[PDB]
A paper describes a structure:
Two main SH3 domain-binding motifs, proline/arginine-rich motifs (PR motifs), have been identified: R/KxxPxxP (class I) and PxxPxR/K (class II) (where K is lysine and x is any amino acid). By comparing multiple homologs of GPR54, it was observed that the SH3 binding motif was ubiquitous in the C-terminus (CT) of GPR54 in terrestrial vertebrates, and human GPR54 contains the most redundant SH3-binding sequence including two class I RxxPxxP motifs (GPR54336–342 and GPR54350–356) and two class II PxxPxR motifs (GPR54339–344 and GPR54345–350). Of note, GPR54 CT dose-dependently bound with Src by surface plasmon resonance (SPR) analysis, and the binding affinity was calculated to be approximately 2.6 nM. We were not able to co-crystallize the SH3 domain or SH3-SH2 domains of Src with the whole CT of GPR54 or its PR motif, but a chimera construct embedding the PR motif (333–356) to the C-terminus of SH3-SH2 domains yielded crystals that diffracted to 3.54 Å. Consistent with this structure, SPR showed that Src bound with the peptide of GPR54336–356 with binding affinity of 4.24 μM, the binding was only slightly reduced for the N-terminal half of the PR motif (GPR54333–344, 28.27 μM). Furthermore, GST pull-downs using GST proteins including GST, GST-GPR54 CT, GST-GPR54 CT (R350&P353) incubated separately with WCL of 293 T cells transfected with HA-Src or HA-DUSP18 were performed that GST-GPR54 CT (R350&P353) showed no loss of binding, which also significantly strengthen the arguments for selectivity for the first SH3 binding motif. In addition, immunofluorescence (IF) staining assay by total internal reflection fluorescence (TIRF) microscopy demonstrated that Src co-localized on the membrane with Gpr54 especially after Kp-10 stimulation in pre-osteoclasts, IgG, Src and Gpr54 only are showing as control. These findings coherently showed that GPR54 bound with Src via PR motif after Kp-10 treatment.
Src consists of 4 functional regions: Src homology 4 domain (SH4), SH3, SH2, SH1 (catalytic domain) and is activated through auto-phosphorylation at tyrosine 416 upon SH3 ligand binding. Here, we show Gpr54 recruits active Src and the phosphatase Dusp18 through the conserved PR motif upon activation by the ligand Kp-10.
Author numbering: 87 to 247, 333 to 344
Write the structure that this text describes.
Amino acid sequence: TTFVALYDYESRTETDLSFKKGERLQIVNNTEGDWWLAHSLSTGQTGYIPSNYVAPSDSIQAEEWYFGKITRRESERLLLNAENPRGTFLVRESETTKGAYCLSVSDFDNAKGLNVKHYKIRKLDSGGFYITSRTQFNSLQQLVAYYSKHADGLCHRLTTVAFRRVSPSAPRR
């Protein structure tokens, strides 16, 4: 029944709540379309939070490496950062196939230099995800936990989560 914060937010009014990314919140009243009343489980503060800054706990949008409907052009811009080591990755929605996802990872080939590898993740009719038929998965979170321990078909193992994600615009009310 808990939620989790996706970004950092600073209080603008006297009735809203300031919170940092990763803060676990408790939605106590969601009878409001834009701003919900939440109780921070870590700092103990209560206040109104923007509903777009949070996502349900153990959901797909709540993961730090899930970036949503970011385009391929915009996905390479985050991974091509010089700070990102080899293996910096993110999971985006497949713009070609609805319901599918793409995995964009940063890679260093000695022949092409720094580059970005894109692997499309296919959704089974049963609800499963896979990149190759040799290994199938049920959810994207556990898929990342595999390819983060061993490469296994990928040019490199998943390492760093892509940081530097702009905070979305707070909705007015």
